[PDB]
């Protein structure tokens, strides 16, 4: 007999708003290579692979969509990188009876059942800082928490979130501030409130400006605790910026003992995954296949869960292991693919892949503190285990974390 | 003759509430189709308006779109797009097929942003264009100091938005700005208490009857006050829980209704030889069985836009069209070229665009006892008001005063 070729549709952004196509794509074509030499997987099956590069832009991804879903061969699979991207094929999907696969969309609103009946990504939702944050505040013992927003859609659905999360922790919001390009006002009174334990929620640029109006109004300091997302550039809060007044001094100053989360993307641990590789060995795996130095490569930090989506899919496949006779017009294969895709448990060299009835990937979160203008890992927490590692390498001015009032 | 394919977009069937519009529209776009034909304007040509259901859904709405492009003629322009969401998204992507879009019914102001959607076009103004009218308004009754009341949803925060943009520049001072989502009562209470006497007001019908409640309890009405709201509700929308009719319809009192001017009230002959009134006569024995709707007149001057871009293309080619796969990137740049010269008197007064945006009429209403009565129009070509004499009317002696 013969293997039965079965095709994947995926859109990769090679520019754009979130270039993660560059080290993607090649993680992909490393992934479908570990697949199909394994004869244990799809021995009857040969997975492969059909692209187009939608530049991150919505609009661009439409000419592409119809592409790949009016143009044979049939594809099984519809496979996006950029949120903006995703909501347009995830939504779109029904209508062809197609599971899509995301491999780098964070926005909340992609967990919605109804909009996007068979959606799954293994890039975690950026709701998932939020068990951590509630975590971090009970060990710490706080009830009273200030939120301080970027106007996005991304940071209103996370900060919406999170207010679910801290009632059912008997914890409360005091006070929320959002701000479009200018963080004088929010912050002014956030000091006027007298806002202890704040969650900031923007991009780089305007981490600059917040902790710049941080510095000016004193919010730093024993009395405060700044929670951020640890996805900013190593020494940011130093980077030349001229829009704003503060020197470097005064901003490592107004920086200094701030906790972040991050999403791990990247087993911290020396253990092998189902390829058979470590975390280690993947990397320098994938820096060969690259043109650039990684540092270049967009989505160099996404890439491992590129290679874990293609796994995913090829597990799920083998599960239901048929597949050659996928129409757009029948929900039969679909559904089956749906169920063995919602039932995803293995080792990845992201780490555990398990997704929630939303479809969003479960991961481990990096809990950082900034101790003398450098961060210094404290701890990981599973949200789904409830389970934390601390590192013990926490400090505080008194001894001991703070608290949210007046005591 | 050789067909000159258009593809249209619109929700027809039964089941989707907004297959009202399109479905209401089809008589004004039988008729503008069949006086051109019979013309001969478009020959040795003839115009080919393909249509596909879009359901007003996003998946459904594209796969019409996909479905179109696959098994359709080639076609050489996109005519519709009436829901909001399901409108971007095939006007977002244009530039991949070379196809110039023109809607006769999506009125969101997202769609003016030429950067996201450079090939689309409409005849219809849009949620912002009674901004300008406000002010000119605001400018004619000398009133320097106003308050806002908005509804916290994206289609009235996008009109509160830009009236900053407008208003900026210009003598007039936004005093107070106020939100509410559910319970308008505290905002009103806040709009009281800052003394605002001249309310521009940007919320749903449901909204309304609540915030004139409210009114009526915190007395912001009468002689003293002004209101300035939307003028697209439902007739008897009041109608349809503390307060009482009697003082809702006390509070109501003298409010003004903005919103576009569906046909022209110019008794001229427009490009078909008819004057808006003999259209409607024509539209109303048409339509038949079929409900009128608003944009039918915007329909109407859509298939004429349209007819006139393919007679200028035509042209520009002769001055050096049945191959245009939408691989052509030349044609629909002459298409897009041809559509920006727009320029003829229509049902709907005068059509031309500035950017992909119409620039039209703004009709302005004021409650007077029972209904929404005419009191005048915004010119947004000339930018000119003018108020209707002896019908606009105010409680006191003068119109009120902002502070
Ligand atoms: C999973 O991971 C490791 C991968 O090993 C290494 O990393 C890769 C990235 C790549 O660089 C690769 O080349 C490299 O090996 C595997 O662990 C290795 O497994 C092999 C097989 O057991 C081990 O080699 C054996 O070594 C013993 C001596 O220790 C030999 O007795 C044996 O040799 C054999 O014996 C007969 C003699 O007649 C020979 O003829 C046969 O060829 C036969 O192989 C092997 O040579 C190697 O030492 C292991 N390394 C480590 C570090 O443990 C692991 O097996 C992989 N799992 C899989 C593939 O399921
Ligand atoms: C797009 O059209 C604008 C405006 O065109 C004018 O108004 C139309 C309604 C129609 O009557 C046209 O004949 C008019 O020219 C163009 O901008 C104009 O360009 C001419 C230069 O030829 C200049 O004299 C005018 O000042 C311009 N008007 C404005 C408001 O700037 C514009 O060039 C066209 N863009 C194209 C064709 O790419
Ligand atoms: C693939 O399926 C077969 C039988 O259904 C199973 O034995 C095998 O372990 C599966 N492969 C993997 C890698 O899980
Ligand atoms: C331009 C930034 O886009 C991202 O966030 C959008 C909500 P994304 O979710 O599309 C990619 C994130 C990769 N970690």
Request: glycine content about 6%; some cysteine; hydrophobic content about 35%.
């Amino acid at each position: 007999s013969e293997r039965r070729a079965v095709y994947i549709g995926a859109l990769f952004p090679m520019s754009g708003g979130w270039p993660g196509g560059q080290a993607c794509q090649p993680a992909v074509e490393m992934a479908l290579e570990d697949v199909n030499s394994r004869r244990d997987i799809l021995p009857d099956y040969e997975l492969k692979l059909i692209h187009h590069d939608s530049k991150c832009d919505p609009g661009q991804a439409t000419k592409y969509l119809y592409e790949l879903l009016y143009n044979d061969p049939i594809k099984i699979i519809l496979m996006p990188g950029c949120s903006s991207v995703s909501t347009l094929v995830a939504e779109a999907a029904r209508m062809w009876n197609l599971i899509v696969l995301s491999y780098g969309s964070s926005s909340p609103a992609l967990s919605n059942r109804q909009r996007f009946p068979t959606f799954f990504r293994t890039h975690p939702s950026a709701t998932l800082h939020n068990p951590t944050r509630v975590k971090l505040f009970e060990k710490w013992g706080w009830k009273k928490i200030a939120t301080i927003q970027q106007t996005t859609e991304v940071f209103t659905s996370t900060l919406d979130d999170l207010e679910e999360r801290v009632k059912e922790a008997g914890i409360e919001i005091t006070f929320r501030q959002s701000f479009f390009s200018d963080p004088a006002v929010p912050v002014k009174n956030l000091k006027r409130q007298d806002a202890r334990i704040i969650v900031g929620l923007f991009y780089e640029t305007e981490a600059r400006k917040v902790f710049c109006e941080v510095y000016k109004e004193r919010l730093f300091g024993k009395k405060y605790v700044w929670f951020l997302i640890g996805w900013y550039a190593d020494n940011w809060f130093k980077i030349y910026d001229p829009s704003i007044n503060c020197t470097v001094d005064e901003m490592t100053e107004a920086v200094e003992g701030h906790i972040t989360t991050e999403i791990v993307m990247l087993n911290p641990a020396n253990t092998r995954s189902i390829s058979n590789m470590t975390s280690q060995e993947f990397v320098e795996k994938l820096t060969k296949r690259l043109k650039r130095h990684p540092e270049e490569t967009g989505g160099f930090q996404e890439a491992p869960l590129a290679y874990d989506a293609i796994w995913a899919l090829a597990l799920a496949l083998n599960k239901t292991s048929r597949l050659e006779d996928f129409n757009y017009n029948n929900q039969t294969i679909t559904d089956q693919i749906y169920r063995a895709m919602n039932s995803s448990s293995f080792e990845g060299v992201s780490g555990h892949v398990v997704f929630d009835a939303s479809g969003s990937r479960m991961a481990w979160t990096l809990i950082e503190q900034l101790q003398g203008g450098s961060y210094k890992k404290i701890g990981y927490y599973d949200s789904t285990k409830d389970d934390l590692s601390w590192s013990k390498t926490d400090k505080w001015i008194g001894g001991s974390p703070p608290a949210d009032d007046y005591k | 003759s050789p067909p000159l394919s258009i593809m249209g977009l619109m929700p027809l069937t039964k089941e989707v509430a907004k297959g009202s519009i399109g479905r209401g529209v089809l008589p004004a776009v039988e008729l503008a189709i069949e006086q051109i034909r019979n013309e001969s304007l478009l020959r040795p040509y003839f115009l080919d308006l393909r249509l596909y259901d879009t359901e007003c859904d996003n998946a459904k709405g594209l796969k019409a779109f996909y479905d179109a492009i696959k098994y359709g003629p080639n076609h050489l322009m996109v005519f519709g797009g009436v829901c909001p969401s399901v409108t971007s998204i095939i006007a977002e992507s244009l530039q991949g097929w070379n196809l110039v879009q023109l809607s006769f019914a999506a009125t969101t102001p997202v769609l003016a942003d030429k950067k996201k959607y450079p090939y689309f076009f409409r005849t219809v103004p849009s949620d912002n264009a009674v901004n300008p009218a406000i002010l000119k308004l605001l400018k004619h009754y000398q009133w320097k100091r106003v308050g806002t009341l908005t509804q916290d949803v994206q289609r009235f925060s996008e009109v509160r938005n830009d009236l900053t943009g407008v208003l900026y520049g210009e003598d007039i001072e936004i005093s107070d700005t106020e939100s509410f989502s559910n319970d308008p009562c505290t905002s009103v209470k806040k709009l009281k208490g800052n003394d605002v006497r001249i309310i521009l007001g940007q919320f749903d019908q449901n909204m309304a009857a609540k915030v004139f409640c409210c009114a009526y309890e915190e007395n912001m009405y009468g002689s003293k006050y002004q209101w300035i709201i939307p003028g697209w509700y439902e007739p008897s929308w009041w109608e349809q829980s503390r307060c009482l009719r009697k003082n809702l319809l006390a509070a109501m009192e003298g409010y003004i209704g903005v919103d576009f001017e569906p046909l022209s009230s110019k008794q001229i002959k427009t490009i078909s030889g008819k004057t808006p009134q003999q259209y409607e006569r024509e539209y109303n024995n048409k339509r038949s069985g079929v409900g009128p709707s608003k944009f039918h007149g915007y329909a109407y001057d859509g298939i004429w836009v349209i007819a006139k871009t393919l007679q200028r293309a035509m042209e520009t080619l002769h001055a050096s069209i049945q191959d245009f796969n939408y691989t052509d990137h030349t044609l629909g740049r002459i298409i897009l070229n041809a559509m920006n010269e727009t320029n003829f008197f229509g049902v709907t007064g005068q059509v031309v665009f500035r950017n992909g945006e119409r620039m039209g009429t703004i009709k302005f209403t004021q409650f007077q006892d029972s209904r929404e009565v005419k009191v005048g129009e915004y010119n947004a070509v000339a930018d000119t008001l003018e108020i209707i004499n002896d019908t606009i009317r105010f409680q006191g002696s003068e119109p009120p005063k902002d502070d």
